[PDB]
Amino acid sequence: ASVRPYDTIDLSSRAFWASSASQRESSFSELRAERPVSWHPPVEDALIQDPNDPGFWAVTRRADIVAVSRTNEVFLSGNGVLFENVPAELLEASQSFLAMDPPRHTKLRKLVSAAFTPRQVRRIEDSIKINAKGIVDELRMAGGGVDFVEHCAKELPIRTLSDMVGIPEADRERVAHAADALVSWADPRYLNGREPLAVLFENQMYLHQVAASLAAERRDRPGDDLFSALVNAEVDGDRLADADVAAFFVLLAVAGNDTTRQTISHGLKALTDFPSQKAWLLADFDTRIGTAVEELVRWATPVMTFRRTAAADFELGGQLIRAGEKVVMFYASGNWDEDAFCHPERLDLSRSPNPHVGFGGGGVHFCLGAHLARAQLRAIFGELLVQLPDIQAGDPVYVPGNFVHAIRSMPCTF
């Protein structure tokens, strides 16, 4: 029946998700301490209001986030993974195997998983380094005071993504813009008065146009790339339908662009806010970039929320989650868990171990592009230190929303 008192702490209002991350942490802190698994009403003023939705369970502790992520046989992804209620047509055209359970998730992920192994990322790491060098070079020619997001943070992800999938150059900047749009539906500075559902469809429609054109191109002459193997594979005795192919292209475009782009912006600001941490990394880069990248991901946590649906009754945090109830993981709360980290509010690029859940709590849906993301962050931050040793981030403009911890724009000086 899902009938129980709602928690006192507000995790659903628009104003809560339009406030600073520090303000939200004071709410996450009390929950982590007193009621780590709490019941809340659905996200207010959602893209679609669902009378079938009684609420959700808030999972704030890192250990519990790992428990939900790894126990996928109980906490399913096949009934949706987004925190806010989103119209089904928009979900069906974007989620792909992210919102899928085995065995179908195992089938589809296997078709593209070969291009993300550490071996294959090492094979293409030089091209990422070459793109990072030219991007920082072009940023230097732009001069100080320019927007770091548009002139750097968004450039390396789309170049790395498009090089793997084979996106035509004329479509590269529009795909990056369309991918960023699909997580900015709560940003008035992005909508600019437009109703969000129409903006989401328009950008989804364009990405499906690029997907249909690339799928038809690769079915004629297949290549060694990621999209070639997907559109030419035989799944259950037949090639994948156009809807499945386009949905994965959206998933790949959004996850491959938005997450790394925000981590780069958050990383430059973190290096500016902690100069002694930047000097520590610079003093021995090749030996220390590994743990530094892991903490920059922990510091950014670009994916703030992902949800699951309980397949059966499950006891978590002293609370009996019922079958069919929504369970939301708050990765920013888990990465500030005092039960897991020593002073998580301070940037420590030497943090070891770093059991952060920036790539999720681990398990079946663990981030497909984790090795690729790490290679991008190592390359772009090494080039920013090679070419622009005095670079500093300005005032960031944070994007309101309950899904991605995003910076709309941020000037930089050097």
Ligand X SMILES: CC(=O)/C=C/C=C(\C)CCC=C(C)C
Q: Which residues are annotated as part of the binding site for heme b?
A: 105, 109, 308, 365, 367
Distance CA 392, CA 76 (A): 43
The CA-based angle 81-339-332, given to 5 degrees, is 35
CB contact set of 169 (below 8 Å; sequence gap of 6+): 162
Across the beta sheet with 75-76, what order do the strands follow? 37-40, 56-59, 326-330, 305-310, 75-76
Which of positions 158-217 make contact with ligand X (CB under 6 A)? 182, 200, 204
Residues 7, 84, 244, 258: which binds ligand X (CB under 6 A)?
A: 258
Distance CA 89, CA 102 (A): 22
Q: How far is the CB of 283 from ligand HEM (least distance, A)?
A: 25
Pull the structure tokens for residue 132. 């990072």
Distance CA 354, CA 360 (A): 13
**Which partner, ligand X, ligand HEM, none, binds residue 254 by CB below 5 to 8 Å per kind?**
ligand X
Q: How far is CA 110 from the centre of its chain?
A: 21
Pick from 184, 121, 127, 15: which is nearest to 369 by CA? 121
Residues 254, 327, 388, 393: which binds ligand X (CB under 6 A)?
A: 254
The residue among 369 and 396 lying less far from ligand HEM, judged by its C-beta, is: 369
- E strands, 233-354, are 305-310, 314-316, 319-321, 326-330
Residues 59, 255, 270, 289: which binds ligand HEM (CB under 6 A)?
A: 255
Is residue 360 near ligand HEM by the rule CB under 6 A? Answer: yes
The residue among 69 and 259 lying less far from ligand X, judged by its C-beta, is: 259
Is residue 326 near ligand HEM by the rule CB under 6 A? Answer: no
Is residue 38 near ligand X by the rule CB under 6 A? Answer: no
Stretch that binds ligand HEM, among 2-10, 33-41, 194-202, 367-375 (CB under 6 A): 367-375
Distance CA 338, CA 64 (A): 13
Stretch that binds ligand HEM, among 17-25, 48-56, 129-137, 259-267 (CB under 6 A): 259-267
Distance CA 140, CA 151 (A): 10
Residues 97, 148, 249, 336: which binds ligand HEM (CB under 6 A)?
A: 97
Interaction site with ligand X (CB under 6 A): 86, 90, 94-95, 98, 182, 200, 204, 250-251, 254-255, 258-259, 303
Interaction site with ligand HEM (CB under 6 A): 69, 97-98, 109, 251-252, 255-256, 259-260, 263, 297, 302-303, 306, 358-361, 363, 365-369, 372-373, 376
